[PDB]
Structures are given as C-alpha cells and as structure tokens.
C-alpha cells in the first residue's frame, strides 16, 4: 500500500507530508496520488527525520527518553489525509502523542475533524485559512504561522498603494483560498476596491477549465489588469500554463498569495507569462543545518527514507540498478557522482516545520516537568499520556524558534509572523528570480518603488474609469458598480455639491472658480460714470440753471404791469414745481435708498401736479378773487394724501430684481399698480386740463401767449401718450422715468418762461 | 459509550438518525448532545425498525436472506456522528454494507468524506446541499430528495411573485443553509431582487447572538419587512424566541425553507410570532401503515429501541416505576392509560425514509439478483459484500416507493421531487395550523393568493424605493446596492431619456407631457388676430384711405389756379411715397417670407427718401420741368443702391430667433446695419432738411404754406429723433415700426394736403 517513514522511540509523533502530488482529476477515485515534490515532500521529510535526531541528541530536551515519528503521506488530498489518519488512530481502537497537521488548509481541516475525536493535538506549519481559528470547533488545532486575514489585510494595501481599484479575483476551490477570498473580498469592497468577478478554480482542473478561466479573465482585459490571486502553486501553475497555451506575453499582473510565495516550480519553464507578479511570502530565514545535513545526503546510505529512491531517480533523470526501486522508465544511468548541491532550493515553510516540531517537543518537555519534576524520565503518571493536558500545556509553551525568535500561541493557536512582499523579475538575459521589494507586519506596509517598476511606466492602473474633477463633470453610475462611472457635466448655474451630485444655489448667486462653492452675484446700480447718465446730469444742472435764471429775472421785474395779470405766486409756484422735477431727475440716479426711494415717489407725485395746477388755476380763472392759490392747493393736498396712502401701503425697501439669473440689479418697491395711481393721478389732471383747454387755447392773450400755451398742451399731452412705451417696452426703467420727467418739465418752460423774459428784456 | 439498537440478520444496514439534540454550546468539547426528539428521532427508529421487519416479512423482496440494521444516534452534530460512522467501519479495520444517511448536510458530508474511503453507499432521506451533487467528491452518495437548487428557484419565484424586493436574507451556518443563500443571492440577484444585507448564525447559538442578530435585522426594518430565511429548524425557533423577548409581534413575514417546513417543534409556544411565514415543504404523503404500527406501541413491551423508555418519560413528563430507567426527575407516575394518539403528528419526511430503506432494499436485491442468478439467496460471489457493484446497482434502480410513484436515480445520484408553499396561518381562536396554499415543480409555481392574504393589504412589500419614475423624477442611485433610488426631477427644458441620464432639448424643442421625446415647440407669427394688429391695420387703411381721396382731388384739379406755385409731379411724388409707405406699412405685418419680406424691406428702405426728397425740391423751388426730377431720381438712384448693396449682403430668409428656449419666433432676415443705413442716410437727410424749413419759416407762399411745412417738418425731425431708441429698446420691432411709419407719414398726410382740401372745401 502506502508506504510509511518510521523511527522507533518511546514516544510516536505522527506526520502528514505532502510527499507526492494531488491525484490528477481523473484518478481520485482511486485516490493514486501522482509524482513526488521535492520541496513539500522531501526535504520537509528529512526536517523532521535530522530534527528529531537533533532533540534526541539533546540532553536538556526530554532527557533519557527517545522521540519517534512515524511520517506519513497526505499526497495534498484531504481523502487521502483521511485514510492516513485512520490508519494513525488504528493503534487507539503504540499510541500517538500528537501529529505535525498537514500542509493544505482544508485537508487540515478534514484531518482535525477526526483527530479531535481521540484528544490527539496536532500542530500545523502552512494552515493558513482563517476557518481553524474557531477553537470552538478546531479545539486541538495550534500553528506557528498567523491566520491570513492579516494576508488579506497585506493584499489589500498593496492594491491601495498602487491605486488599483478595477481588480479582477481568482481563488481555488477549498477552504483556504475560499475564506481568503471572502476576507479580502470583505475588506477591499468596504473600503475603496472593486472586484470585477470573483472566479474560482480547482488545482487539479484540467487545461480546458484554464482555458475558459483565461478567456473570462481577458473578457475585462482593457481595464482589470491586476488578478488578485488567493492561489496555491499549482493553480498559478495552470494559469501561466494557460496564458502560453492561448497566446498572453503577460497583459495581466498576477498578484500572488502565500500558495506562490518565491516557489520556483510554479513559474518553471513559464517565467516569461509571469514577469512582473507580486507575492506575499511568510518570512523564515533559511535554517542553516537543516542545509548542512540534507546536502550530504546519498541515495545509497539513507535507509530510513522509503521516498529518497523515487526522489533521487525523479531529480536526475537515472536509474538505480543496485537498488530496489528500479524504475527502468528513464533511459540513462546515473553515475556515483551526482549531488544534491547543484540547483538546490531549500524552501520558505522550513522554519515552520522544524519551529512546529519544537514547540511539540517543547509542550512534551513542560507536561513531563509539571506533571513528574523530580523524575527525569518516564514518570508512571505520564505514562498513558492524557490528550487534553499535553494540549493545555502546548497552549502555553513559548520557547526560541530556530530562527531566533520566541514562539508564542495566543488565545487561538496562532503565531506571530511579519511578511515579505516578493517580486517576481527579470534581473538578465533568460534570467529570472525573485526579488524582494517589501514588508508587512501589524498594518504597516514597507515598499520601495523602485525595484519594482524601475521606471514610471507601471502597470496600467486598474481603474475602470479615468478621474474627471475638472469643473463641471461629476460622476454617475447607472447599475453596474460603485466603481465604473461615466463622468458628466452639469450646468455652468450649479456647482459641484459632492462627488456624486451637483446642485445649483438660489437665484442671487454663482457657482465660485472651478465650482468648488458658491457666491453671490456682483450686484451694480446706475453707475454715476456713464454715458447716459452724465448726459442727464447734465440735462438736469443745465435746465436748473435756466430756471434759476427764470426766478431770479422774475424777482428783479417784480411788479412789471404787463405780467400783473396773473398770480405773483402762480409764475413761482410753477417754477418751485419744475425746480422739483429737475431735483427728481437728479435724485433718481443714485444708489436706491430707503429714504432716496422715498424721494423719488415724492417727486414723481408732487412736481407734475404743483406745475400743471398753475395751469388749472390759469384756465379757469380767465372765464375769483385770489382764492386760485387755494383750488391750486387742495387739488395739491389731496395729491399728497394719495400719495402718502400708497406710500404707507408701500414702504420704501430696496430689493435686488433678477432680470435673468446671470445678472442681479438692486432697486426699490415701486409697483405697478403704485406708479400707475399718480400716472391715473397725472393723467386725470391732463384731461381736466383739456376739458378748460379749448376757450383758453382759442382765446389769445396780451403777448399772445395763449396759443404758446395750446402748444405746449399739445407737446405735453404728445409726450405723456407716447412715454408708456418707452418706460415699459424697455429693462432701463430709470433712464426712461428720468429723461421723461425731465423733458416734460422743460417743455412747459420753452414756451411760456421764455416769450415772457424775452419780451420783457426787449 | 452510546447505546444502539441492533438487529440480527446477514446482512446488515446502518442507519443515523438525531435521536437526541444538538450538544449545547457549552458541552460540545464534551460531545453530550441534550433532549432527545420525538418526530426526529424515536419516530424515525421506529419506521426503520417496522420497514425492516416488514421487508424481511416479504417473500418477493430479498428472498431467503433477513436484512439486519445497527441503528445509531446523531444528535444532529458532525463531531457525534464521527465518533457513530468510525464505531460503523471498526469490523472493517459483520460488516455494514451501507448506511442510511443522516439529516443534516454538514453532518452528511462529514460521514460521507470517512465512508466513502470504504465504498459504503450512503443514502440521505434529507440532505439537501448542492455540494452532495458532485460526484467527484461524494462518489458513495445517493439521496432520495432533490437537491436545493429547486428550493432557491422556487424561493425566488415566491419572493418575484409579490414584488419582494429589498429582501433581508439570514442563513444558518453549515453546508445546507450556507449553500442555499449562496444560489439565492446568486441566481436572485440575477433577475430583479435584492437583498439588504446576509446575515449568518449556528443554530446552537445562545441567546445573545440572536438578539443581536435580531437588532441587526430591524436595523432595515421600515422597508425590509420580508426575511429569506435558508435556515434549518432550531434556527427559526431561536429567532422566534428572540421576537418574543424584545418584543416584535408581528413586524417580520419569515420566509422559510425545508428546514422549517411544518414542523410543530419551531413555533410551539410561539405562534403569535411567527403567524403569517411563508415556509417550503418537500412534499411526501403519510404512510398510513406506521401510524398503525407506531400508535399500539408501549414501553412495556418495546425492548428492541433502547430510547423508547427516555422518550416515553420525556413525552408524558412522569417516570415509570416499573423500570430500570425510572429517571425519578419527573414528578408523577405514568399510569397505565397514557398512548400515542393523543396530539401525535407524524414528521413531513415519513416517507424519504421509509423510500431510503426500500431503495437500499432493492438495490442489494438487483445486486443479488445480477450476481448469482440461479440461487435464490446468499451466494459466495457476493458473501464478499463489494460497495462497488452494490453502487453500481443503487446508481439503477427503479422501484415503487410508500407514496405510489416511481424512485430513480439520476447520474448524480438525487431523485426528482416537488415542493409544497405551506404558509402559517391562526385558523381560529388561539388555534394555530400549517395551511397549505400552493406547489411547486419544475418552475411551475401555483399559490393561491386568495388564501393567503385574504384581502388587497398583503404584506408591506419589502421595497427600498417607491416607484420614482412618476411624470419628469429621475431615479439615483447611491454608494449601495442600485435598488434605493432616490427622487430627483430635472427641468422642463430637459426631459427624462434615461432614468439614469435625462437630456435636455436642445435648442428650439420642447418635451412632451411624458417628456419623452421633444416636441420642436412650433414657432409663432405675427398675430394677424389681435388688437394691436387690428388698430394697425385700421389705420393703415384710413391713412390710404385719406391718400387716395387726396390723390383723386389732385387729378380732378390738375391745373387749377391755387396749385400752380408747387410743381404738379412733385406734390404728386410725394403723394406717392406717402402711399408707399402706408403700403410698406400694410405689408409690414404678416407671415415673413422671400415673397413678403423682400418688398417689405425694400418698402421701408425707398419710402423715406422718395417723399423727403420730392418735399426739399419744393422748398428749394420755392426758396417747372427743370433739375427738379432728375435730382428726385438720382437721390432715389443712391438710396435703392444701398439698398440693393445691402440686399446682395444680406439676401432675403427667415430665422426663427430664439429669445429664450421658452419660446420660439421667425422673422425675416434683418441685421443692425439692415436698419442703420437707411437710418444714418434719411437722418442726414432729415438734418439737411430741416434747416431748410427753418430758413422757410413763414414766407409769402400759396397762400403761405411755410409755416405749415416748417412746423410739421419740425414734428418730424422730432419724430425721427424719438422712437429710434424704442426700436433699439424694445423687443417688438414690425408693430411698433408700424405704428411708427404710419403715423409719421400721417404727419405728412395734413401739411402738405390739408390746405388744398380746405382751398377746394372753401
Ligand atoms: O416713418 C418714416 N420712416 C422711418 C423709418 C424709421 C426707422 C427707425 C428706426 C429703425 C428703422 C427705421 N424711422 N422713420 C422716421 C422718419 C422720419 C420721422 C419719423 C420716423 C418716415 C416718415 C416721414 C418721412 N418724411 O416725411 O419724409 C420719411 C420717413
Ligand atoms: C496613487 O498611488 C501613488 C502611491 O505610489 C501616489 O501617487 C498616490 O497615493 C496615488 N495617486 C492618485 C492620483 O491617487
Ligand atoms: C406585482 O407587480 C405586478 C407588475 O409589476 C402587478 O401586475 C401586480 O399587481 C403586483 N402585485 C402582485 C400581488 O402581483
Ligand atoms: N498556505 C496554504 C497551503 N499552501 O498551498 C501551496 O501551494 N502552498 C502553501 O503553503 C494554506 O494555508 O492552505
Ligand atoms: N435540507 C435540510 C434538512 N433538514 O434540516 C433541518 O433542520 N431539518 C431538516 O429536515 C438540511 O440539509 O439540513
């Protein structure tokens, strides 16, 4: 059958060592397990078989007492691992104290669900998944290597690092890569990363099912160049594999795990499809002993290793015609003069294996010390060791790993362990090694840049979409994921409010430079330099000064007889009335104030009705006595007192009008209906005007100067019908109301003050 | 050790059932496994008990040979059942020759990874894990229940048929209820659910982890009021004790699965609770031949099923004073009147078990029947039982099972098989039943909507968002699973396109009331219908009105004495243009086009220059058949060949301008300096002009018209200086151009005619 190591001694330490390959998928029903491994097979076998030799010959570990091993085979198949266990507990049904658990996680897994049933402890070195921890289920499962969530955890800085963010995930079938997987699924997707499809694999597919595995991983090609691979070699293998078969110089960048580690016979004929991949391999300093002794090692003196025979004719292509084991397949035959020294690599988990056989050794060492400290040997009462102490006791038994370390189990099994992050290269001419760029130990990420991608070319970023934080384009993602988005621009009125979501401020405002915030509008008034409004300051100081002129010509011609026909007072009350429209004029160019507001209302009221009573006055009292000051003024007052009912009714306030949202204008809270009661008011004293007109405007004067009147009745009346248009069709407003205003009052004075001066100076 | 219930006979079958509890979480390191079960577990032992017997009883079923069976307890916990599958193989390190498989799949994956390694068939009466499908890993295992693939498809199909979709998902550790979420997530998610969050629990778990995971799931309570629950029995139990305790009577519709099926044991003492669940049941009739057996049975008699004396204890609380196993816990006395029938329910999976024992049956007897022929029993080539054959004729067989059908195996080793949606209902006063409102198979989903929800108010369907694709709103999604929109309108200038991207009509079309699709907002013309139109054209008619009775008394006095000082053409050019422009006038309004706008423009640009210039001839003469006309034609020459210059620059067609995107107009080619030439050249002219009818004044004349031109070309030049801002202000330009040259030609209408009506009047 399967063939067993053996050591006799007074205390049987099994072992489960990968020493052949996984049965290939069409075998496993016979479960006939393929080729031997150097590495995993071999050379761990020896660790054990010189490490127990080591402690034997040691007098302060286990003194006068002998430790033997009897090292099975698990061919890295948990129904193997299975059948051998059986045949471990057997004897139960010499005793076993405890095995070295085996290398695969879920074949650890399989093993330990049986071992815990007979209180046997077992100690693994590479069983990795997370899944053990729970000692609730896994009572009698303890490692020297820590969990791999803090591998998870390794993974996902490195992609932070290097702004990955459009990974793509392949994870073989089991429980390591599984749990693996879910962790760093787990801990990438919260915080920033996005898988683009998690795949999965078994090891022992055929090349086919690579084949379809390769083609889903190209279907992401353009944007997911980076395969977070939660991986044991040979699925790594299979993939390089594949990538030669269909045709990749290597467009991904393989992103390894504790399975790839710095093995060299996963990337063995295949380093050209891998140049470039990232790995996280536990740090264990080769042991330097272990070198010594297996270098020297001979097919025809090692008796004790039933697979040094298949191992040695597997290395060097040869045959052993003095031995047994003839395996007459290979053609030539090899001479007494090949060595081990010529291409030998002595794996990464080696400290692990012989750090794993220490701490059994040592857990032996304390429970013979407590439970017999005078007795150096056997003691009666250890004699049929307990399980459950030994695990107690293994619980706590720190000691010096042969890598100078202390070895400590924690509340779970687990060991310490830092990181080393390797990187697969190609440092000459078909030449490639593994180089290590990195570190990791308790969240910190040591890494230089420049080893690794030694210029800036780096690999294409894993990003599905380019940033776009310039201005205006946000981002939206429709269905597919949080991380693919298709950036758009939102309107020149809004401003970037997230990441996400652009909204725009409220009419007075704008978005700030480059649409980080927003301000408000710039508000402007009339400014006083300008054009159109100089032009009417000017029209105003002239017309004033012509009317000044006016008052103080009548002043000095006080009592002229010719103009004793009319009130003294009326030819200045109409002059106070168009001294008051010119002060309107100039007061409404200003910024608007309460108080400024306020004016202008007042002189729009008051100026056309004081001038244009005097007129009332004039028409009426030609057709008694001196009373026209007083029909003039009750007409006035009861101008005034509308005047202040809208005024009350609206307040002088300044609010900024929004003609269009890119540009904000401040004025006051003139209304419509406020304007149109004095303009109806105005209006009103025109048509009465008109209805005294026409005797007035056919019966002419002294100086004839009734018909200069008619005329300016009828420019006044031409010039009121046609303002409406030009004050309403147009946004000016004020220049409009200004320069009617304005005209209107000199209208009136261009034909009566002037033929009245004019002939009086002549 | 633990006891078991053997049976003589040669050939032997195993069998597992969960006779006791799961060990407590406290004592699993103990492996005490608790209670023991009445429908699990003795109902179970006493089916396989009576169908052994009742098949060594049949003559055409495995002739001249008694079937045997090793009965053993689970206690439904993958450590126990180890320790009871390695008791099974110890002869083989009478032999089992294949075991009746236990419940659990976890459990059945553990036994079935140690049996198969001896090629004992195993059958499972109720693992249901897709796992157990792969025939790779689990070679020697058969089941006569289909696999859950059917039950996630017809749990999605419930959770699609009343518009479930933000769906909370819980799921008991394991293999059954680990794989079940996986498939429902997985072929879920695919077609329109979702899922708030999944959340994970051992079925053993203390109190505290169900409170916890109870607080976890109202924490989307408001809208995930419907829970997937792929969880085995206990599981559902424990959650329907934590809704008791922190009070939630009736927020949650629990969505079983098989694992809750109609079992009595997870909502006894707990109806309230758990009062409007939806569970699925494999659906297997009643055997009606063991409830006959199994109601006559007592513990005095009953020695052949070791649990028989603890169940009867446990089931009537008492303690049989009569027999070893007194157990003097209870307090009273179990008199001799106590049977079965009271309150006895048979378990759902009654007849997979009994169909699991028949199938072993028949096919040792298809394998006895191939391999010795001629012998009607035992013979030698098979007296070596070989798993082999005996799975090679299970994989092929087909018999009638208990429920009348036909069992078969496919090359995986299930059975088909169809489901039943039963649903927990209060039938009457405090009177809780499992009612039955609905099947499923093979994608065939009936329910039976009327009996479940008795009304339109079903439960409040477990969605995020509300429809938000409501008239113009949007749908966003947010950093979480795309299923909570949020509700955001954009514009009516834009429509919704997409509901994740809305465009906006560009620039002259508008959406329709579904905004889908622009509408291209038509255009809108003059108004021909409008009484600004309509007081325009009525004076434009008046004013030709005027002009042709002007012209008419003109041609009747050709030549009388009073007009004789003006030239006879010259009043009648610009009689001319004064009708032209009324003309141009007239046409200024109406739908602008090459065969309107044309002549239009032409109207506009000619009419000025004509009528001034005929008018500065007459004051030149006055300041026969002489200079006269050839200076009217040459200034009509110039001015018609900037007018013709200005055409070639700018030739004659319609823009439909766009003032803003609310609103549409269309006017005819027109651009500033379309508008300003013959402005600057009419205003020179109105200049030159008007201080020549200054210089006129008033001068002996025909009967002294110089005065009358003078005034009135003062209006004009007034005029002209007026409205140009109001065309350069105001948005409207062909109506006010109209009132504009109308008016102003009717400026002209009197001056120049109104003496001569007055002379011919006079
Ligand atoms: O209505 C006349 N033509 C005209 C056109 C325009 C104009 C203004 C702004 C933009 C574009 C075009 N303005 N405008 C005008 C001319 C004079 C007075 C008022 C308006 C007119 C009236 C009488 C005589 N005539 O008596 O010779 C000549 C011409
Ligand atoms: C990308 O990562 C590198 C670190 O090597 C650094 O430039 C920075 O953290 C990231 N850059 C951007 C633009 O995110
Ligand atoms: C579910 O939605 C469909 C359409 O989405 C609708 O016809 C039906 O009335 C809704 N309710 C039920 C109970 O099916
Ligand atoms: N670390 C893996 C085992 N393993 O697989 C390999 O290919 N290398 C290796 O160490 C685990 O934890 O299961
Ligand atoms: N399909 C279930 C079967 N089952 O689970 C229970 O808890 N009861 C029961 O019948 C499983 O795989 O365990």
Do not use: A, I, M
């Given at each position: 059958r399967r063939v067993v190591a053996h050591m006799p001694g007074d205390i049987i330490i099994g072992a489960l060592?990968?020493?052949?390959?996984?049965?290939?998928?069409?075998?496993?029903?016979?479960?006939?397990?393929?080729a031997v491994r150097e590495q995993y097979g071999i050379q761990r076998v020896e660790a054990m078989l010189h490490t127990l030799e080591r402690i034997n010959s040691d007098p302060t570990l286990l003194p006068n007492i002998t430790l033997g091993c009897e090292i099975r085979d698990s061919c890295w198949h948990s129904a193997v691992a299975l059948e051998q266990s059986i045949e471990f507990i057997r004897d139960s049904l010499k005793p076993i104290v405890g095995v070295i658990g085996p290398g695969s996680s879920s074949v650890a897994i399989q093993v330990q669900n049986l071992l815990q049933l007979f209180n046997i402890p077992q100690i693994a070195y590479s069983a990795t998944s997370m899944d053990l921890s729970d000692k609730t289920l896994f009572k009698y499962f303890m490692r020297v290597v820590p969990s791999d969530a803090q591998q998870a955890r390794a993974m996902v800085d490195i992609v932070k690092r290097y702004n990955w963010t459009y990974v793509s995930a392949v994870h073989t079938e089991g429980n390591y890569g599984e749990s693996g997987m879910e962790a760093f699924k787990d801990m990438s997707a919260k915080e920033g990363i996005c898988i683009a499809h998690s795949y999965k694999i078994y090891s022992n597919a055929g090349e086919q099912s690579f084949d379809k595995l390769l083609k889903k991983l190209t279907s992401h090609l353009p944007k997911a160049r980076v395969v977070a691979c939660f991986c044991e070699g040979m699925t790594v293998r299979g993939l390089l594999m594949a990538m030669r078969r269909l045709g990749l110089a290597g467009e991904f960048l393989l992103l390894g795990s504790d399975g790839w580690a710095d093995r060299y016979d996963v990337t063995d004929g295949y380093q050209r499809e891998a140049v470039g991949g990232i790995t996280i391999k536990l740090?264990?300093?080769?042991?330097?002993?272990?070198?010594?002794?297996?270098?020297?090692?001979?097919?025809?003196?090692?008796?004790?290793?039933?697979?040094?025979?298949?191992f040695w004719q597997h290395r060097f292509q040869c045959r052993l015609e003095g031995f047994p084991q003839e395996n007459s397949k290979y053609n030539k035959t090899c001479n007494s003069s090949l060595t081990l020294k010529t291409h030998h690599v002595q794996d990464s988990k080696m400290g692990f294996v012989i750090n794993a056989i220490y701490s059994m050794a040592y857990g032996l060492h304390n429970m013979q010390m407590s439970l017999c400290p005078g007795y150096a040997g056997l003691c009666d009462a250890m004699k049929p060791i307990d399980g459950r102490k030994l695990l107690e006791s293994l619980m706590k038994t720190a000691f010096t790993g042969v890598s100078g370390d202390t070895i400590l189990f924690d509340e779970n099994g687990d060991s310490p362990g830092r990181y080393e992050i390797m990187n697969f290269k190609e440092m000459g001419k078909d030449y490639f090694d593994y180089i290590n760029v990195g570190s990791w130990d308790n969240g910190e990420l040591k890494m230089d840049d420049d080893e690794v991608w030694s210029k800036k070319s780096n690999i294409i970023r894993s990003v599905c979409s380019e940033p776009c934080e310039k201005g205006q384009i946000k981002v939206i993602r429709k269905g597919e994921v949080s991380c693919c988005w298709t950036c758009t621009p939102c309107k020149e009125n809004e401003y970037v409010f997230d990441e996400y979501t652009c909204k725009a401020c409220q009419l007075g405002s704008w978005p700030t430079d480059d649409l980080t915030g927003c301000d408000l509008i710039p508000v402007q008034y009339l400014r006083w330099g300008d054009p159109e409004p100089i032009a009417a300051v000017v029209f105003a100081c002239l017309g004033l000064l012509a009317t000044l002129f006016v008052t103080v010509v009548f002043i000095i011609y006080r009592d002229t007889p010719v103009v004793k026909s009319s009130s003294r007072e009326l030819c200045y009350i109409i002059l106070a009335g168009i001294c008051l429209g010119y002060l309107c004029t100039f007061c409404l160019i200003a910024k608007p104030k309460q108080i400024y507001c306020y004016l202008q209302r007042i002189g729009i009221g008051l100026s056309p009705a004081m001038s244009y009573s005097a007129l009332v006055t004039k028409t009426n009292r030609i057709a008694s006595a001196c009373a026209q000051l007083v029909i003039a003024f009750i007409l006035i007052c009861i101008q005034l007192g509308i005047i202040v009912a809208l005024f009350i009714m609206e307040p002088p306030d300044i609010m900024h009008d929004y003609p269009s949202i890119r540009e904000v204008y401040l004025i006051c809270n003139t209304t419509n209906l406020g304007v149109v009661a004095p303009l109806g008011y105005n209006g009103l004293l025109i048509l009465a005007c008109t209805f005294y007109a026409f005797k007035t405007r056919n019966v002419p004067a002294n100086f004839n100067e009734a018909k200069y009147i008619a005329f300016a009745m009828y420019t006044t009346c031409i010039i009121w019908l046609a303002f409406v248009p030009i004050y309403f069709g147009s946004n000016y407003k004020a220049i409009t109301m200004c320069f009617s205003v304005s005209l209107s009052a000199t209208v009136l004075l261009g034909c009566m003050f002037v033929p009245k001066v004019y002939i009086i100076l002549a």
């Open positions: 060592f990968s020493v052949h390959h996984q049965p290939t998928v069409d075998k496993v029903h016979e479960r006939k397990c393929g740090q264990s300093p080769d042991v330097k002993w272990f070198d010594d002794y297996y270098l020297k090692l001979r097919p025809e003196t090692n008796l004790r290793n039933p697979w040094f025979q298949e």
